[PDB]
Scaffold this active site. Structure first.
Site, PDB file in Angstrom:
ATOM      1  N   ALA C  10       0.793  -1.231   0.000  1.00  0.00           N
ATOM      2  CA  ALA C  10       0.000   0.000   0.000  1.00  0.00           C
ATOM      3  C   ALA C  10       0.831   1.290   0.000  1.00  0.00           C
ATOM      4  O   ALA C  10       0.317   2.360  -0.340  1.00  0.00           O
ATOM      5  CB  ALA C  10      -0.981  -0.005   1.168  1.00  0.00           C
ATOM      6  N   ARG C  15      10.032   8.941  -1.758  1.00  0.00           N
ATOM      7  CA  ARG C  15      11.445   9.109  -2.133  1.00  0.00           C
ATOM      8  C   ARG C  15      11.817   8.574  -3.528  1.00  0.00           C
ATOM      9  O   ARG C  15      12.942   8.765  -3.992  1.00  0.00           O
ATOM     10  CB  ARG C  15      12.368   8.532  -1.053  1.00  0.00           C
ATOM     11  CG  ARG C  15      12.410   9.354   0.232  1.00  0.00           C
ATOM     12  CD  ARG C  15      12.876  10.773  -0.064  1.00  0.00           C
ATOM     13  NE  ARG C  15      13.173  11.543   1.145  1.00  0.00           N
ATOM     14  CZ  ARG C  15      13.945  12.628   1.167  1.00  0.00           C
ATOM     15  NH1 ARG C  15      14.505  13.075   0.044  1.00  0.00           N
ATOM     16  NH2 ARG C  15      14.162  13.269   2.311  1.00  0.00           N
ATOM     17  N   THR C  79       0.706  -0.758  10.083  1.00  0.00           N
ATOM     18  CA  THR C  79       0.851  -2.077   9.469  1.00  0.00           C
ATOM     19  C   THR C  79       0.089  -3.210  10.161  1.00  0.00           C
ATOM     20  O   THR C  79      -0.397  -4.119   9.493  1.00  0.00           O
ATOM     21  CB  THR C  79       2.324  -2.478   9.349  1.00  0.00           C
ATOM     22  OG1 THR C  79       2.918  -2.455  10.651  1.00  0.00           O
ATOM     23  CG2 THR C  79       3.076  -1.512   8.431  1.00  0.00           C
TER      24      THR C  79
HETATM   25  C1  LIG Z   1       4.965  -0.753  -0.135  1.00  0.00           C
HETATM   26  O1  LIG Z   1       4.312  -1.023   1.105  1.00  0.00           O
HETATM   27  C2  LIG Z   1       4.996  -1.217   2.286  1.00  0.00           C
HETATM   28  C3  LIG Z   1       6.234  -1.863   2.322  1.00  0.00           C
HETATM   29  C4  LIG Z   1       6.891  -2.049   3.538  1.00  0.00           C
HETATM   30  N1  LIG Z   1       8.081  -2.677   3.582  1.00  0.00           N
HETATM   31  C5  LIG Z   1       8.735  -2.861   4.758  1.00  0.00           C
HETATM   32  N2  LIG Z   1       9.971  -3.522   4.804  1.00  0.00           N
HETATM   33  C6  LIG Z   1      10.672  -3.846   3.564  1.00  0.00           C
HETATM   34  C7  LIG Z   1      11.946  -3.000   3.565  1.00  0.00           C
HETATM   35  C8  LIG Z   1      12.726  -3.182   4.854  1.00  0.00           C
HETATM   36  C9  LIG Z   1      12.031  -3.633   6.098  1.00  0.00           C
HETATM   37  C10 LIG Z   1      12.773  -3.785   7.255  1.00  0.00           C
HETATM   38  C11 LIG Z   1      14.144  -3.510   7.250  1.00  0.00           C
HETATM   39  N3  LIG Z   1      14.839  -3.101   6.166  1.00  0.00           N
HETATM   40  C12 LIG Z   1      16.282  -2.863   6.311  1.00  0.00           C
HETATM   41  C13 LIG Z   1      17.119  -4.040   5.802  1.00  0.00           C
HETATM   42  C14 LIG Z   1      16.743  -5.370   6.448  1.00  0.00           C
HETATM   43  C15 LIG Z   1      18.605  -3.772   6.009  1.00  0.00           C
HETATM   44  C16 LIG Z   1      14.188  -2.909   4.923  1.00  0.00           C
HETATM   45  O2  LIG Z   1      14.821  -2.526   3.911  1.00  0.00           O
HETATM   46  C17 LIG Z   1      10.539  -3.917   6.092  1.00  0.00           C
HETATM   47  N4  LIG Z   1       8.183  -2.427   5.909  1.00  0.00           N
HETATM   48  C18 LIG Z   1       6.989  -1.798   5.925  1.00  0.00           C
HETATM   49  N5  LIG Z   1       6.466  -1.374   7.098  1.00  0.00           N
HETATM   50  S1  LIG Z   1       7.241  -1.579   8.481  1.00  0.00           S
HETATM   51  O3  LIG Z   1       8.533  -0.961   8.358  1.00  0.00           O
HETATM   52  O4  LIG Z   1       6.495  -0.950   9.538  1.00  0.00           O
HETATM   53  C19 LIG Z   1       7.389  -3.210   8.825  1.00  0.00           C
HETATM   54  C20 LIG Z   1       8.295  -3.512  10.022  1.00  0.00           C
HETATM   55  F1  LIG Z   1       9.537  -3.680   9.608  1.00  0.00           F
HETATM   56  F2  LIG Z   1       7.889  -4.628  10.602  1.00  0.00           F
HETATM   57  F3  LIG Z   1       8.259  -2.527  10.904  1.00  0.00           F
HETATM   58  C21 LIG Z   1       6.312  -1.597   4.722  1.00  0.00           C
HETATM   59  C22 LIG Z   1       5.075  -0.953   4.685  1.00  0.00           C
HETATM   60  C23 LIG Z   1       4.423  -0.768   3.467  1.00  0.00           C
HETATM   61  O5  LIG Z   1       3.210  -0.135   3.421  1.00  0.00           O
HETATM   62  C24 LIG Z   1       2.026  -0.811   3.836  1.00  0.00           C
HETATM   63  C25 LIG Z   1       1.646  -0.261   5.207  1.00  0.00           C
HETATM   64  C26 LIG Z   1       0.407   0.623   5.079  1.00  0.00           C
HETATM   65  C27 LIG Z   1       0.280  -0.803   5.610  1.00  0.00           C
END
Ligand SMILES: COc1cc2nc(N3CCc4c(ccn(CC(C)C)c4=O)C3)nc(NS(=O)(=O)CC(F)(F)F)c2cc1OCC1CC1
Ligand SMILES: COc1cc2nc(N3CCc4c(ccn(CC(C)C)c4=O)C3)nc(NS(=O)(=O)CC(F)(F)F)c2cc1OCC1CC1
Ligand SMILES: COc1cc2nc(N3CCc4c(ccn(CC(C)C)c4=O)C3)nc(NS(=O)(=O)CC(F)(F)F)c2cc1OCC1CC1
Lengths: 450, 450, 450
Positions: C10, C15, C79
């Site tokens: 979503a 960026r 989320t």
């Molecule tokens: C395109 O849609 C996305 C994609 C997405 N991707 C991600 N991640 C994907 C990207 C990501 C993540 C964690 C850590 N890194 C660093 C790496 C491991 C070195 C990342 O790059 C998690 N988190 C999200 N949310 S979050 O950060 O809160 C998840 C959490 F990590 F559990 F906290 C997230 C939310 C989102 O929107 C939907 C929300 C509205 C309901």
């Protein structure tokens, strides 16, 4: 305080094996020294003192428009003596930064950090840590504070172990420079005045010598040969590509992208692998550039797709136009909105009006083509064997049949139709249909080799 | 002492998934084994004993001109037994270096270091340190000295911890080889004679076994599959590009340069990104090669600029000539000084004289064109539907108008002028003007679809 | 247990600076989210719950055929609340894996390891170690066991030192999710339900929280901007190139290879530097692809060589055919076995029969050409200025002379011969020879400018 700069640019660059002087070798299509001049100016320098010598004439022709004070070095008496030639121009109350026209990557930010760390009446110098400090002047510290610099040929077993080296870049106030420079002697085997002596002279005057370490080694790195130049080019290109990517330009592979000039872009611009951008290039929103294209001094409107292996120079392309693959735009090509230019098509010094299509195996030179024209495959604009190059004028809604030769000077008015295989030498009037009458022999029962 | 070499080249190379045998796979356009042969010869080998087996016929056709002694391996009885087949040719008083036709990067310098470290009546072997020594034979040292080699399947917990491994490369005198080889038994599950046993046999004879560690891992690295071959190719290309750069050739990006042959260059040569050089290529001073060009077996005079996406093979180009972009030079193309070849132009087996221009959409085959000719756009040399390909002869100062077909055999003498759209079948005499008389219908008030 | 997946898709992706939503940005020619869907399916998911919001219409058009359950997010409440919208579809006895449509590289193998490490009634989460954990949620361990996750803005001096971070990827059973999700409160400044609270809720329920560390950082890496997208693209391309290399495809430089689709290959396939493969491409045995070729949705038979700078789309090429250099195959091009297509040749929606040659400066559209035809240089198929595009039919063994225009609709029967420079408008019968009768003026003693 105010600021002025001194750029040493006199060096020979023997290891380049070139009839060009060292500093005129290019990074991203412009001479090393020009990068340094621009940084000096962006830094805020009131004056820029260009010390030059070897390949002097080439310097002056290649850097004619550079806003600099030209300081010629007649006698090669070492770097302290060279800067001394620029010294009579130093104002007492301004900072003076010493730079090198062969270390092109030095940044504004690092130089700002160096200036601000300069103590009043003192010196600030740039230093850098190396795993292998071999060949370079070692930074000598007594109880944390910088006292001297020692070159390889004078360094003892322990000094040779020091991993911090001299970048040559330094800042001090004008009066101090004049003062310390005069006191530099040349009692050495090579009989020349070394700029490094200024560290000892400041310390002996009980003035502070603060070193600023540079985090990025490449920034203070000089190109002494073409291997090193290539390393610098790649670093510089990667820095340029990163910026564009964070600005929203999609570069499918920054390691296969080359910017040799300035790029202006809109949003959702996509650039495929192996594209070279030169001179001033402007790209509107949602422009797509396929693999192997070369764009030099061009303006591309919104929503233009440029298909692979197209080469464009000094050209203008209107919005929603389609170019390529294998298209050639030569200087003076103007394409209006929604035009089509296809494979193996060459366009030189010509305007092509809205919605017109030039799709295959065609040369258009010195021409004016109106809107909604259909220019067939194999169509060629040419001249009589004469003095100068004349123009071809085509109106709106003209159909030009395949493999037709348009012999300039000629005019083809609105709505004219020209049949395939025609040689147009006389003006064609409005709504005139021109068909070539062919004469043919037909021979029956001609059998080809079996 | 004198020197001869043994190259094992019999292996199948199953993991290559190829109908070609392992060692015939190329690095920089030549078979792996050929690199090893050249190094062996440059080392100073009097004899080179090529041990071959799998894909034998292909070896013999692909390496016909190689100055080697062909030693066929009928029965696959392990590496010690293979070298034993070459052993009757060893001279007692010469050193014998054992090499592998699938480890192509081994250098002259490293092999010179290995030979010189060989003790009299002893063995010198190449070893190398690996972070992950898994799968390879471990080097066993007793109190500093080398005593045995242990393969993975026999290595205990501690031995599996040794990070120094066997490269298979070794030097010993002829008589010693003959002597130790004979004493190698095949009391093993696979029932084959292993070359590694020679270390134990030397030690049991109380002869020194000196190991020489190689600093560069890639040098002793073998290509067992195409991923590994590609890694070797990239290393080898980077080594080639570095040399040229330090010699004064400007390669804008060594990581996007490919040399598959030999290059001869003058000074101030500039080579843009994505250029491939194949066969024997000679470049004079100040030659500029743009992006995406391919040069194969060509000679380029001084001050020639080759514009992007030009492909040249078996061609000669005189000084100050201009080629490209999108130009095709096919075998037998000779361009004299100051000639111009432009976009979408194909030249095959033809000589083009001084100052002549061939600038657009043209095919010239089997032709001789004099000096200062103007060959128009769309000009084509062709033939009748007949037996063989005849020639087109054009003199000096000839004007050939756009979209003219020259039907060979035909001659066009000095100073002739040929109008656009012409079909030339009869010889054209000196200062003769040939114009096509067109017949046209003109229809007024023809309205195109609105 | 059974398995279903939830993909968060979503997000806005500010960026990216795009009118496209984050997850629709492509890796290897397909949207980020599509990679995640495919992995979820290959994992064995019965259901895939796509949570979407921003750029909703674009999602639905771009992912229309995706076998997913579309879950629209109206209110942006964090989320945990988003996944709760998919929660009513969870079966109690199935595992539920939570994934992110912007972290496209997550693999089947890593996810299989995560699921299997999930304790009954517990949680398994993916974590990863970083040198610089700045900005990301820290993994909090009490005596080895995972108890909480702490984001940057809440982390104390010591917690900020933890190098293990949260990837957001987690597995738990359906009933557990429903249960813990309901118990998540939004007592925070941003007023939203955080998915991370589930770790604390499991621990407070005295359920095990097992972390699985990922060895490959890029696998769990998300693309938040185009620099990061490019890094992901390069990783993904290198992974694709390695596979093909180990399968036996020779890619001269995997760092200059691009696969944006699916490739089917035979043995001894050679691919030179800078080749782009798009859509569905099938290559038979011993196919050679030279530098700068682009193949999109094509089928290439055995032993076809494609010479440099050829561009092919929706085309079929029979065995032993020769294409290029500088050839253009447009959709609908079918080349039979042993055909020749040369430089600056464009072929559109046409069948070319066995052994036929189309070697220079030619356009063939909407045509059917038989076997053993000779299509001369400069030959062009065209139309009258009319309504639709008609077809050109050429039989077997036809000779079509240079610079001939074939005006459709027209038929040229078996064995016909057509002389150079002809305009064919009438059908040509079997074994008919068609010659153009030229009319020429010859003017003697015409002297060109001296
Ligand atoms: C395109 O849609 C996305 C994609 C997405 N991707 C991600 N991640 C994907 C990207 C990501 C993540 C964690 C850590 N890194 C660093 C790496 C491991 C070195 C990342 O790059 C998690 N988190 C999200 N949310 S979050 O950060 O809160 C998840 C959490 F990590 F559990 F906290 C997230 C939310 C989102 O929107 C939907 C929300 C509205 C309901
Ligand atoms: C093109 O013209 C140049 C460029 C130039 N550049 C440089 N540098 C630029 C290059 C350079 C430098 C220091 C250290 N490294 C190693 C790096 C930090 C790892 C360098 O690469 C300094 N020094 C120069 N001289 S210098 O070495 O004596 C300066 C000193 F470093 F202070 F000693 C120098 C002289 C010169 O000629 C003018 C002389 C006649 C008056
Ligand atoms: C193409 O033909 C070849 C090439 C070849 N090459 C090699 N090597 C070449 C490749 C190689 C090697 C050692 C270690 N590494 C790892 C590296 C140093 C990190 C290698 O890559 C040795 N060994 C071979 N045999 S071997 O492994 O037994 C040699 C031994 F290393 F001494 F054991 C070998 C046999 C062979 O077949 C001929 C046999 C039938 C008579």
């Amino acid at each position: 305080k105010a600021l002025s700069a001194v750029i040493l640019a006199a060096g020979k660059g023997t290891r380049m094996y070139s009839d060009l002087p060292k500093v005129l070798h290019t990074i991203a299509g412009k001479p090393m020294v020009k990068h340094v001049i621009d940084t000096a100016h962006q830094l805020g320098s009131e004056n820029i003192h260009l010390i030059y010598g070897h390949g002097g004439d080439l310097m002056r022709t290649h850097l004619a428009n550079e806003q600099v004070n030209w300081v010629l070095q007649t006698e090669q008496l070492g770097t302290a003596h060279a800067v001394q030639q620029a010294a009579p121009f130093f104002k007492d109350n301004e900072n003076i930064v010493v730079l090198y026209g062969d270390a092109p990557l030095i940044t504004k930010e690092t130089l700002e950090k160096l200036i601000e760390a300069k103590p009043e009446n003192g010196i600030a110098l740039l230093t850098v840590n190396l795993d292998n400090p071999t060949g370079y002047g070692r930074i000598i510290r007594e109880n944390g504070n910088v006292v001297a610099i020692v070159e390889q040929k004078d360094a003892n077993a322990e000094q040779l172990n020091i991993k911090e080296v001299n970048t040559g870049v330094m800042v001090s106030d004008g009066a101090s420079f004049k003062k310390w420079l005069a006191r530099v002697g040349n009692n050495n085997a090579q009989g020349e005045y070394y700029l490094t002596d200024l560290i000892a002279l400041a310390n002996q005057d009980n003035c502070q010598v603060v070193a600023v370490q540079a985090t990025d080694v490449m920034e203070v790195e000089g190109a002494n040969n073409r291997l090193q130049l290539a390393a610098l080019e790649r670093y510089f290109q990667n820095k340029q590509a990163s910026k564009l990517l964070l600005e929203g330009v999609m570069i499918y592979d920054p390691a296969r992208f080359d910017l040799r000039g300035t790029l202006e872009h809109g949003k959702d611009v996509e650039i495929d692998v192996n594209v070279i951008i030169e001179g001033n290039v402007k790209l509107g929103d949602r422009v797509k550039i396929g693999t192997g294209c070369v764009l030099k001094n061009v303006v591309i409107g919104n929503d233009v797709e440029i298909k692979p292996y197209s080469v464009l120079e000094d050209s203008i392309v209107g919005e929603k136009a389609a170019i390529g693959p294998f298209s050639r735009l030569r200087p003076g090509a103007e394409l209006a909105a929604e035009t089509h230019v296809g494979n193996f098509v060459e366009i030189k010094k010509s305007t092509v009006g809205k919605g017109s299509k030039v799709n295959h195996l065609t040369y258009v030179g010195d021409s004016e083509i109106g809107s909604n024209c259909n220019i067939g495959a194999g169509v060629i604009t040419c001249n009589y064997d004469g003095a100068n190059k004349f123009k071809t004028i085509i109106g709106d809604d003209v159909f030009v049949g395949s493999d037709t030769q348009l012999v300039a000077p000629v005019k083809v008015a609105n709505g004219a139709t020209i049949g395939a295989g025609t040689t147009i030498t006389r003006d064609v009037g409005e709504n005139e249909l021109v068909i070539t009458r062919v004469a043919q022999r037909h021979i029956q029962g001609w059998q080809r080799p079996i």
